[PDB]
Design a protein around this ligand. Structure first.
Ligand SMILES: [Mg+2]
Ligand SMILES: [Mg+2]
Ligand SMILES: [Mg+2]
Ligand SMILES: [Mg+2]
Ligand SMILES: [Mg+2]
Ligand SMILES: [Mg+2]
Ligand SMILES: [Mg+2]
Ligand SMILES: [Mg+2]
Lengths: 64, 97
RNA sequence: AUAGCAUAUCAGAAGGCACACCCGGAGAACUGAAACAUCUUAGUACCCGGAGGAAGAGAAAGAAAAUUCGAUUCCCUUAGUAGCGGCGAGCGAAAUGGGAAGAGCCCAAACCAACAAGCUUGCUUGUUGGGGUUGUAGGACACUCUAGAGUUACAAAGGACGACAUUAGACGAAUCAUCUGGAAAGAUGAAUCAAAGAAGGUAAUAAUCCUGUAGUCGAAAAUGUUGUCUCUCUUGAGUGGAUCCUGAGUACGACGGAGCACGUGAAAUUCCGUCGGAAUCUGGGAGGACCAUCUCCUAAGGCUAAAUACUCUCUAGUGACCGAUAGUGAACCAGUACCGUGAGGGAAAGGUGAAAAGCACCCCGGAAGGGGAGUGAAAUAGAACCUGAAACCGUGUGCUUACAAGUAGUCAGAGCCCGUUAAUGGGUGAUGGCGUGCCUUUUGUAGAAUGAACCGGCGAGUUACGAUUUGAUGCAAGGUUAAGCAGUAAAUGUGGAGCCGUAGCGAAAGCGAGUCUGAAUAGGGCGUUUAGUAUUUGGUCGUAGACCCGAAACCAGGUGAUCU
RNA sequence: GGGUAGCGGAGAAAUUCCAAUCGAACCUGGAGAUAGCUGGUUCUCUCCGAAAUAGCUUUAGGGCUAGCCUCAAGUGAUGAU
RNA sequence: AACUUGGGAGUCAGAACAUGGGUGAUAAGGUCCGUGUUCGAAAGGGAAACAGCCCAGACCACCAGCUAAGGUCCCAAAAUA
RNA sequence: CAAUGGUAGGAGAGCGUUCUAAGGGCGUUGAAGCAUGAUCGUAAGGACAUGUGGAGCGCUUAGAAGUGAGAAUGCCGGUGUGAGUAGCGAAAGACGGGUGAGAAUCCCGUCCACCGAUUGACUAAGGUUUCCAGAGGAAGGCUCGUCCGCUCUGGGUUAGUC
RNA sequence: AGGCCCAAGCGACUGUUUAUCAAAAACACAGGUCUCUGCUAAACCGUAAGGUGAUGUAUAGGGGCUGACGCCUGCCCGGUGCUGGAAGGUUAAGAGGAGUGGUUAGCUUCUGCGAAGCUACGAAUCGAAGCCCCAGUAAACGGCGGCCGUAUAACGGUCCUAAGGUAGCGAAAUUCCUUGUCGGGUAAGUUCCGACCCGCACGAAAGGCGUAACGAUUUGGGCACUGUCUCAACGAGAGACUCGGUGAAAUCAUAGUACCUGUGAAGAUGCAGGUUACCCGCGACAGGACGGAAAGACCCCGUGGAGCUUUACUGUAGCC
RNA sequence: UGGGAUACUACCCUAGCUGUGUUGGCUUUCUAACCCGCACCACUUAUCGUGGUGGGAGACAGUGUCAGGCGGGCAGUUUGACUGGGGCGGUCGCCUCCUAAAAGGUAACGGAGGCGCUCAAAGGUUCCCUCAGAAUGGUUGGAAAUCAUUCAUAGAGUGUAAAGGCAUAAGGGAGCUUGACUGCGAGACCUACAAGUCGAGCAGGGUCGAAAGACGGACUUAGUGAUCCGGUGGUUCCGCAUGG
């Protein structure tokens, strides 16, 4: 039948123009007293899913 | 699955929502309007007939990339600044509907 | 006076089943989450109760910000989107739009001429019946005014004429000769018919031999079906609007549960149990906590065909479906031998020939057999009967072998027999050299690790849908249809809702070859330099039992105390 | 002659019996349960040709990236001594 | 040769020798690392036989020739040099 | 001029089996199968001739697949080996006569032996025709068999009181 | 058609148990004791109705423990279980609803502020078992120590606890060390009996100690008797063996299947070097073919099962 | 001379005082529901049932909903891995050192130790200053406390483990001070991923210094824990027909 989508993932990544996936960052919910001011604005950004993980999850997000 | 290692898409946080009501329009570029002619009074229906827009999605939006090489009036739903100056430079109005 | 008894009447009920389909009551578990409890399997399986040929649903307290498809259902798309999710596994819409189908209809309530009964006809009761059933707010009311339906809802029965079709059937074109043969339909030559060259028979392969086929015709009867003629039913409007009426232990709230893609929760929408508990148009409900305003609607009574689901049957036909270890378990006296107390479980087994012509007689033998003769094209076609492989068992023999230590071959070679798919040939092999099977599994196996006695047959990555990539082919800033309709179970034509692309950025508002962060005109992220799309071959992946075999086990409904 | 039936019965108690094996009978159905485990997987040639390692893992005889193969594009001296 | 992108994988049980070390007992055909090689996945010659040692990588003939490790009295090709 | 050991594995080219479409063919003057042979190609494999066989089947191109077996203590069916081996299931037989194709094994006779709180007589439960008289000898009887609980034919169960 | 006798455990006895490896010391038992139960009894089967108990009535019925008989059954209520009670605290649903927020009818206009309708919340306060809590209860579940004098498990002191083992018994169906030490029994006694205590780790109804009778019970010793034995021998049959008849099976990769010393996945009919051996049968034996038979009755793994337990988690029939 | 405290106001342990719209409760109490495995009487040849008479009990019990306590009687499950076989013991993430073979990396249930913090100065900056010990020694002299003087290569200090560093002082004072900044970052290091590490420089606004310049924490390296969920403050830019 029609293949489904990892709904848990569709809420975490936006698809970018060259087919990349823009992801949000980790280590950013609490315990900020234990992380530096440098770590915090360099975590206030967006990175791309690394190609190794892309090879792992290509189909979980095929319809995005 | 990652052999019990915490999978990527739980290491990472969700963000954002969906504005259930978006106004996104079928866009027509500047250079896509040089398939019309001079002075000719284009309209959304006319360009739908011409097939430059496969469907009026929530309106028509004119954006500015190329050039006119022409002089004509228009009537669409929304315009960008560049579209406005690019139309008015060669002459011709843009009656927002 | 009631139970209760006692009678009479009535095609009232029971039971069965199609292992299907449908609507309810009740309701698992293995499993998936790589454990498991929420959740999943799943409202599935199994139970029971109703049905009907269909059922459920159905004429708006409905979507929508519309300009309502104006009832219902069902198909395509929306879309694996919105959403729900120990936000994990995984569940998962609806509206809009395009189609199939082309149906709206009745009762309560007010009120009532007249009447049956308590009242004194002042008040009233009634099912007798009328009345009218709806948001443009409908109806009574008061005015004024005027006599088509239908048995599929819309009351509800049944004679009386036709019309095709179906449960027997009828007619139906056109070929002869030779050859080979046991026999031709074959081959060869010469013809013929065709609205018929579908098919099956026939001693071999037949348009012209037979049964048929195309075409045409045909019912005594007993049925479905349908045109009518009857027949049976019967009021249609407007305008005021002062009063009146419009479905109560109901809506709805609280507690506890289920259902709706959405986990007593916002559950508004919606149900069930337990307590409470409303309004009557100057009203009530809905528009996803919600309200105020706007818009839509008018609940708490009922009926309703079509499109839709399925096949125990029957009729006709089809198949890049099986041809007896296949295809049904069952081509054959099969749910039968047989097994079990029983539930149950369950086989093996088709083929002489054209015709039975099924072998008159004779010979040996008690008979079974046989050997002649005869039947037949053939009898190593003789009934266990077409073809008749291998394992296996025999009878002959050409060459070898009785001093030898052998995973049994290879390589080298004398001697001895034979002579072909004639080619630098076939069979055997004194004696020499080298040499511990195969599979699986392993660091490593001759292994004394595992697996196979031997022959034969059967026996494992396929299919559906979707994603990705490569090749191919259309044609390209465009590409493309889906359902449906016509058509032959085809091609194809039509169908442009949708779907992808031509613009991206941001959580979003929004902006746009830019956008986001940011005070920046800084810097930085992602973009911007067009190539996509439809179908399809191949490679993968997802959802399915998804390469095959195989558990210890779990759950539901039944069988069994004849042993113990 | 009868009665008690499997989430049950019966037991002078042995986990003993319940139709020749009872820490929960049998027969069907869910059902092709699940099986990170063992075994099997069937024609031929040609070209190339590994690994038994990291990191993480209720993970240790399993998996996921990475390293090591192969195939096809592209890049074009970047590689080796 | 190398790198980049994309399609397809298998591998996560290693082994012995030589050499640098830990552990053990300057024990083990021990165990854990580093660095080669080989076997694994490698036939051939030598080591009597003998996956890992020495020499050497088998496309297919040939009753041709030269050599490596090992050898040259006989088994058994070559010096009773 | 260079390359060609190879397992997990990747890539490519192919050989074969059934069926279908079309074209072209072969077939009682003998198809498919089966058997033999000293034949051809690099391999999967392809022909040819001769026998049996008594009706279908090749070839070219292209399409589809229930397409290729040697192992799963695989399933079904045949046939081996162990081997002329183990076994022949508690026990007393001998002999004369007869019957027959055939006799330790069947019929008759004599003697002998065993049981005798039973291997005896009844009758229940259960089995259903095994009961009786003729006939037969394939099969069943753990041997043989003229015999039988076997086979064929025809018969046989009688109640007012059991 | 009984062998018998002396002496120890164990169980009182007759009885009953794992059909198909255990018949006993295990189970029953008569007798004790504790506890529950007033009768629609308690307890039990059922969802309920209906039953059992019982057509019984505290000299009756259910359950727990122990288990004839005789002498006895010590100390501890701290903890838990069962009580029974207690006034505070701590307590749910309900009841209660001062107060808080949303919306707007008005008002203000530098945008605040709002009277009630409707809503979203919600609190003092009241609210039952109960749970802390407090005396009893050991034939309830349980528990019955430590240390230092002392020259030694006598006796004192000391710590801790709720209290620290009474009677009887003891190398035991309990004693590791252990064949404890002395005696008896034998020529010789890891076994047996008596005693000692020096109880790893007896002990009083999961009863202590002792008992006549009983037992296909366990364990020593003795007489009798014998092929059990030194030490085997001969007979009688049935198999076995030869002949006639009939005639399987487990097993099986093909087999012309030698020994020694080596090599090797480290125990060779198949490999290397030697040694030995003409071809084919029949009776026999069992060393090997890591013989056959059963996908190890042990062991370890699997995020495999199942049965059982509890102060593991979550829930639950049922009860208050 | 106190202990609260008699203006008013809930209003009293503290008397008195009767009924008022109508009503419950503590509490006795009475019958009509309900109930009786309860006698009699019938239906009726009935130990069932139903209907009547009396007696019992009684608004209780029983029953429905809701809510709390008990609940291995019963049900579904969980109960880690490494490990010279399991078990028992130990261990599990971070930092330092050696093993480690002079880049980097590198294992064992190998050899040694630390961490789950601390500092409003033990931070920034400006200006100053140099130490442990030893003898030539002395009012004390436990010896050496403080003081004196020449050598002292740091033998001392550096908040802490260890190792690299340090007189440029990174060590010790002293004065100002808050850069223990906001927005970022070309570039590199590490590395499977997620993370981790170092950054010149550029804006904004500072503080210190006369200025040049230095400052995005402690000489360097441990002092910790993704993601979902929920809380608090800002900002709305979302918020279903519109406003909120
Ligand atoms: Mg073998
Ligand atoms: Mg062998
Ligand atoms: Mg075998
Ligand atoms: Mg019981
Ligand atoms: Mg048993
Ligand atoms: Mg064996
Ligand atoms: Mg095994
Ligand atoms: Mg066992």
């Amino acid at each position: 039948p029609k293949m489904k989508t990892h709904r848990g993932a569709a809420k975490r990544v936006k698809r970018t123009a060259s087919g990349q996936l823009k992801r949000s960052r980790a280590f950013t919910s609490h315990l900020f007293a234990n992380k530096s001011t440098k770590q915090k604005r360099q975590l206030r950004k967006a990175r791309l899913v690394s190609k190794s993980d892309m090879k792992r999850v290509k189909q979980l997000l095929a319809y995005k | 699955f990652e052999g019990g290692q915490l999978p990527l898409f739980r290491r990472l946080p969700k963000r954002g929502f969906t504005n259930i009501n978006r106004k996104e329009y079928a866009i027509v570029n500047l250079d896509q309007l040089n398939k019309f002619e001079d002075g000719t009074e284009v309209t959304p229906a006319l360009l739908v007939e011409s097939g430059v827009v496969k469907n009026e999605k929530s309106g028509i939006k004119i954006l500015g990339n190329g050039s006119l090489d022409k002089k004509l009036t228009v009537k669409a739903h929304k315009f960008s600044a560049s579209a406005a100056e690019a139309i008015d430079a060669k002459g011709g109005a843009h009656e927002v509907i």
